Design a protein around this ligand. Sequence first.
Ligand code: PCG
Ligand code: PCG
Ligand code: PCG
Ligand code: PCG
Ligand code: NAG
Ligand code: NAG
Ligand code: NAG
Lengths: 432, 438, 444, 437
Amino acid sequence: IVVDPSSNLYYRWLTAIALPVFYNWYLLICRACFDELQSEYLMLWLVLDYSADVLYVLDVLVRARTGFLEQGLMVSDTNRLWQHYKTTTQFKLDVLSLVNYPEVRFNRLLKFSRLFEFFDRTETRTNYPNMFRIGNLVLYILIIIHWNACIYFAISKFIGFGTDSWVYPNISIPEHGRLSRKYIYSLYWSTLTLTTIGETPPPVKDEEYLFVVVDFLVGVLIFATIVGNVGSMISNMNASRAEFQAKIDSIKQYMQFRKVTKDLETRVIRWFDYLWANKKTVDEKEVLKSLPDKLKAEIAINVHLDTLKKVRIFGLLVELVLKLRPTVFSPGDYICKKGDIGKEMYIINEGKLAVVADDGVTQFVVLSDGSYFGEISIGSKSGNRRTANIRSIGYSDLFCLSKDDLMEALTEYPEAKKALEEKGRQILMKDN
Amino acid sequence: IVVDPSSNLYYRWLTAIALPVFYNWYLLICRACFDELQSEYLMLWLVLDYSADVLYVLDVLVRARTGFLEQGLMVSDTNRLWQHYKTTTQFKLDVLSLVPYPEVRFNRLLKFSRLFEFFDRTETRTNYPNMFRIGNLVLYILIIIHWNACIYFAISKFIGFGTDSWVYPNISIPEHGRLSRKYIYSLYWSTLTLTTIGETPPPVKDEEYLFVVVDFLVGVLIFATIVGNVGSMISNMNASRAEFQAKIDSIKQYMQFRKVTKDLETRVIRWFDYLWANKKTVDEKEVLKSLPDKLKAEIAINVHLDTLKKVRIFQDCEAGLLVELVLKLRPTVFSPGDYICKKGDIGKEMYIINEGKLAVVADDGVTQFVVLSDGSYFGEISILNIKGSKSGNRRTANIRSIGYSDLFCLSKDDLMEALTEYPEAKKALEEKGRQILM
Amino acid sequence: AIVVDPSSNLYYRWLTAIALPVFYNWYLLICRACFDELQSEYLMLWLVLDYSADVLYVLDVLVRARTGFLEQGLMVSDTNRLWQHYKTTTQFKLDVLSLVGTNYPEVRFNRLLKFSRLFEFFDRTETRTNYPNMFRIGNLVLYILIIIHWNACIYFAISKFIGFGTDSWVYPNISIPEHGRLSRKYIYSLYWSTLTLTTIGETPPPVKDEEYLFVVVDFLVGVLIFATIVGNVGSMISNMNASRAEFQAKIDSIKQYMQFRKVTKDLETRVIRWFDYLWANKKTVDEKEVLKSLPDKLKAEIAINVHLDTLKKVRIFQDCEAGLLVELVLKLRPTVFSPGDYICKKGDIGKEMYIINEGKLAVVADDGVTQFVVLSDGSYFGEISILNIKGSKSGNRRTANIRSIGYSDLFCLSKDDLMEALTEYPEAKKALEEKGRQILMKDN
Amino acid sequence: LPNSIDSYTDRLYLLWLLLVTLAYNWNCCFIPLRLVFPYQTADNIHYWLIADIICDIIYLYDMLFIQPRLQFVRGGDIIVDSNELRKHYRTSTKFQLDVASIIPFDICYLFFGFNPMFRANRMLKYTSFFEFNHHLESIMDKAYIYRVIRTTGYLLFILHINACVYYWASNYEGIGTTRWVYDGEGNEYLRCYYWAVRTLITIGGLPEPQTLFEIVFQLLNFFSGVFVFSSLIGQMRDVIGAATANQNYFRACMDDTIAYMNNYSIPKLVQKRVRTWYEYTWDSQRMLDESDLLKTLPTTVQLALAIDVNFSIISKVDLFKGCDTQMIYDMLLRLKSVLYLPGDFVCKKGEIGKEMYIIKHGEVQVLGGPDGTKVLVTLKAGSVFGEISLLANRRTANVVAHGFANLLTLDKKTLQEILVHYPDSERILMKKARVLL
Ligand SMILES: Nc1nc2c(ncn2[C@@H]2O[C@@H]3COP(=O)(O)O[C@H]3[C@H]2O)c(=O)[nH]1
Ligand SMILES: Nc1nc2c(ncn2[C@@H]2O[C@@H]3COP(=O)(O)O[C@H]3[C@H]2O)c(=O)[nH]1
Ligand SMILES: Nc1nc2c(ncn2[C@@H]2O[C@@H]3COP(=O)(O)O[C@H]3[C@H]2O)c(=O)[nH]1
Ligand SMILES: Nc1nc2c(ncn2[C@@H]2O[C@@H]3COP(=O)(O)O[C@H]3[C@H]2O)c(=O)[nH]1
Ligand SMILES: *[C@@H]1O[C@H](CO)[C@@H](O)[C@H](O)[C@H]1NC(C)=O
Ligand SMILES: *[C@@H]1O[C@H](CO)[C@@H](O)[C@H](O)[C@H]1NC(C)=O
Ligand SMILES: *[C@@H]1O[C@H](CO)[C@@H](O)[C@H](O)[C@H]1NC(C)=O
């Protein structure tokens, strides 16, 4: 057997090893600082520690018998795999890890790297990354508050219960002799100390003074860090929406400075409402330039042939959809007025447009998702211009394309070259 | 009949239905937990709850008659609207928020999406987006503080009033027994718990210990949300001033490190202060590129065509060259006393004077020959021409500014792309041919 | 006439050995002047440490009179010029003011004036370190331990001026053996100072009006300075990610684009596997982006000294020259393609030329996966359709189908960058042209 | 007192803006204090009236005289005449706000009690206060200490307003009646300011409020204290970050470069060479590069800054004289400053030359002896080398930097592009090449 780190089996094993490391950190500092859960029910810690021990040695076997990506290929030679694993600090920590019995159980905490690999893999893999970031920083403040609650109960056990007012009170009293009372009061003191709140009892000895000073300074820096990253995450949750409202506000400030007319004001605001409520508010040319060009062209052929498998006369478009550049035209706008110069051609995708001749009247035909706008402008007594009025009837999208770009993508297709020139000359034959 | 989801009739319905949702949430969790409200203002809550039922039923009717787009055209087929509304999940939420102790109205508090949609479309629509983000934030934290206040009073009613210390005190006494006293002390408790101040009486039972720990952790995450949010709102309110002051101290620190001449520092610093006091410090094309092409032409056409109809190309009706020019304008302001074109040198552009006061001067000292005002266009000699009576492609004179002049620019290749299929290339040629004679 | 340059290791070792005395003075002169039992009990330890700090301060004057500076590029060496540029500066007057019975360090407060040497040490350690964000977090922790300790001593001086146990706010009456020990005095006054500057306040409330004014001034000094501290510590602990957050934002925008545009699940997990590969093999830093600021000699030097595995094996690099090889790798940019995809097809245009570097991809036939020959690192392809072959059967058309067998780190190189490279180096250029022409004769 | 006071080149106008902000800040700091505290008794009432008359005379003298006597820009040109600028200040909204400010309520002071609430209409000069703070911020050389002092002044002012409202609430409920209120027995302003710190900072530890008005006051004070603490402290952290932005950007770029070189394999001598390059460019540039900061300016002011520094440097030298000054202007525009670490070669013999260099603040050397070790000439700052770019091509000698040299590059493409515009200078520099063979 051999497995790669991209495998869904490997992610499922990262889940099943993310369970007992989290168990071991949380309940092992709770056991080794409380010394009442053990003496109440040892047997659950026997069966859970046996399960965590066999999952740790199975993680040693799976981290032995997984492979990597050397020279672009996965590696299956198991003796060199064992030598590569044996020269690694992760296996060094694992044989320092796998040497009842809460001291060697406390030695079984050193496999945190599986939990960090779980957090990366889930942070990339999920479709609720924000859920994950809210969930793992809530997990980090609960582990910090739990370890500080158990450190407080160990300091109170080292001083003595109820010797003075700072420590836990006397456990001969049956109200302070419940394990639920011990854990939730030490958690409440840990919350009051770590979140810098106050209304604790005031300390009256020197180790209590040094510990409350160290705990308040760790409380300020841990409060700042972990409950400032939650502020950065919950204010980076709406980020592209914040950039879109930034674009809206900036355009509205420029229009309220420049004293523009009210119909243009509400047309621009309704264009912004169209781009918000139609969910097309992501600018793909700016946020999708950092991808490499091959996967950029692969997602281009995928989504553009999924929208555009309604191809005209010439099937196989692997070179013609390279530089499709969409633009959204508002309803009531004219694509080209009656007699203008022509540079670029427009194809229709998910739009419904129509032809005019006197700007509003003379609808000859409505237009489906088939053909071009600028098959003429690219002898027949004509050339290099458009002679048809095309008003945008609805909220359409239309790709634009360049003549030199289609010519240099057309040098491999002479059949499409002669088909395009023949259908443009045939359109001039039915027009002039 | 159909409503349009962009129109102001649907936005007035959005404001008229954002009221009962906010009433429902706020007064709902007040009424279910206090019970002096429920047993004392019963006719008022019955009138307001009948109004909330009939506005939820009219909201079900509006979403059964709303419109939605299909390839740029909205659907007027009401069977298609009702079938698409039945297939989406907002109808299932809108029926589960209307099926008949207000546990019935706890079922009714389920239309949460409409208040978020109202806040979103008001953040789009209104002219005070930072004020509306401050108001949205303040309403969110007041809803959290009010809900936690009613949860604390229900925990005190479930344990028993005045038996313990951390619980709200005994209601038999007339001090802490009025309903205004109950609600104001309970909201005082929850603002001290949620903003991590904690001057409250400490808990004495383990259930109250657990509730205070859960309440403090929810409160410290709410404290982080309002610190980051309010700080980001004030920084985005002063973001233009912050970026302009970063540009000012960047330029000023660079020039004071370089030991450059002090009147030149004062000239460029007052130039930037002119650019901020004219509010032109953010550029046009960097936000009109987020605008599309036809709307960029429509936002550009009116001001620049009205200031380009004063200048001397307005003789005949060749406005396609003018819309090709005003799609290609580069507005650049000039400090007073600064020469635009020094004489006899290279020329890469043509200029349109818009709200400036210019003077063609002599070389050594300033002797004003002619005063070019708004309405004069200049710089047309640095394009292709005959010999005439002058030399080649250079600058024929010295032109400086008198005051702070705003200038449109027309570069070479943009004028060549705009300078096809029109006789005003030849008309500008004969006008500058007369100028290079005289 | 031995000058010390300010960039050497000897100057930095001297900044460590002077950065100590200054921190000992700033940490313990206010503490010896406030807690009087530290001056009363211990005397010989402060005598030995204070004589060592005095001789190190006079040694600091003797080093700064003989340090160099950068004037017209070259390091100056004339020690009279060094002493003149020392003595016409404010640091000379601050050092002679810093270097002006045996129970009073209240005249010894003037030796706190080498804050310049302490900040010079922290700037040179923050340059010369290897863990910069860990050292800046340690620097801000050292600043708040200085401020908390200084305010603890200021609180005990105010309590000694008012009178111990006179009222509830001050330190209590020190004739009691509980409150009387020196360790109890310092740790309780540090507890009061952390509780004031941190703004918690489990402290007793003040009584006298001078105590009210001190607690108002101390809470405002706490709020402003700890506002600066918690803001800069939070910005440092958000700056310690710096590449894991931008990458996560880019994969969040990619996955929002995937769930919006309804791209199919196999290609969705393909781009998931691509971004997992680029993070896990740590090629997420873009070389020409993060070295956009360096000059050409440093960019050429670093592109030798990271791409020598390319440089020692490629047949272009088999007989060319050093300047040709460094302008080529300086104009070379690395990509990586997923396995089983098409880098370049049969019939297309020739835009880029490609070099194998820790990749293993074979040239394939027109349909299917039938390997012709594998091409390991050192081989290259592209040159026939990039450079204009005169004896060719076609022009600007690729002659074979090339797919990727493994995850191959490859080098794009444009025709424009290649013709800019081959300018007055024609011998290897025609050697590659005859190589491409003879494989064209094999390749019809 | 002229008719034309320059708004930015007059220190006496800035000192007058200091006097009108002292007469504004007196009202906005001592209206509440006089309104709620017993400091305006029958003894010091003429002292407070002399201060109010002095600030009202500064108000009236400023608003009548100084307001319409500065100079402003309208219609593209600077305005210098008196009557049109007087009508401009009349048609502004600032004059309407200032006559809304000064309503002389002394007729009601002689009728209806000495009440500073009648004088509290004089706190409507935020335009003059923010004009003062903008003028002092754009005049001051290191403005990051003044923005911090302005935020600390805002914090001490909002604490002063909360201390006055706390003493008003205690004086409305009766002083010392309950346990929440102020009870007397000391300095009244200091104990109420202690309350305003311990509430607005959200510390706590006060007495607990007892009745309805003090519970809703402590609740609204703590809530607005959370928001104004997290707003003005966030403003403090923002102005400190905007201060430390240049060094933070430089540490970010050097952090990414040294982390990249440690992430890959690069030896420690090249690591030391790259970090001493960064050390020298911060100790001599205080910036990362100049091109990102300079290229966001317009063309004539970029030409002015570059021509002032580098055309004074190239007008020291006369090797390129007898030539077109406009060619020197465009060549001045198209330069890039490049650094060279001491000991290394910028160009070796046998290489292709495609640059030209003019050394500015550096010292380079040539090496063309028996093996390129004997230094022929040492060109100091204000000399030139190149000429293989101009010969229309291998390199003659080994040019090495002696110290931390700083060179201005000049490319072969742009150099031939500027020399094919001007033929006479091309002839003169070709004669310079023919005598410099
Ligand atoms: N002239 C013309 N163009 C039409 C008509 N119907 C559709 N079209 C398209 O409209 C066009 C507008 O741009 P083009 O000149 O590029 O080419 C024209 C045709 O492709 C019609 O009846 N007349
Ligand atoms: N020299 C000159 N140019 C003028 C005059 N009136 C208008 N202009 C324009 O001003 C110009 C400034 O730039 P150009 O040299 O490019 O060309 C010149 C003319 O087009 C005039 O009286 N003299
Ligand atoms: N056509 C072809 N190219 C090959 C072969 N083996 C290696 N190559 C290289 O693969 C190439 C792909 O790009 P080019 O057309 O630029 O030039 C071709 C050759 O340099 C082969 O068998 N056929
Ligand atoms: N060859 C040479 N160059 C010199 C001498 N003195 C100064 N220089 C400059 O040194 C140069 C080094 O670079 P270049 O070849 O570019 O051009 C050469 C000259 O400009 C000299 O004696 N010989
Ligand atoms: C707790 O109280 C009992 C008697 O009430 C006493 O014997 C015991 O010593 C106390 N515990 C401690 C730790 O002192
Ligand atoms: C609470 O109120 C009831 C009402 O009569 C009273 O009997 C009881 O003693 C009160 N409890 C306390 C603790 O005051
Ligand atoms: C402190 O205690 C001693 C002995 O108890 C006493 O003599 C002295 O007066 C006390 N001082 C004060 C200020 O209480």
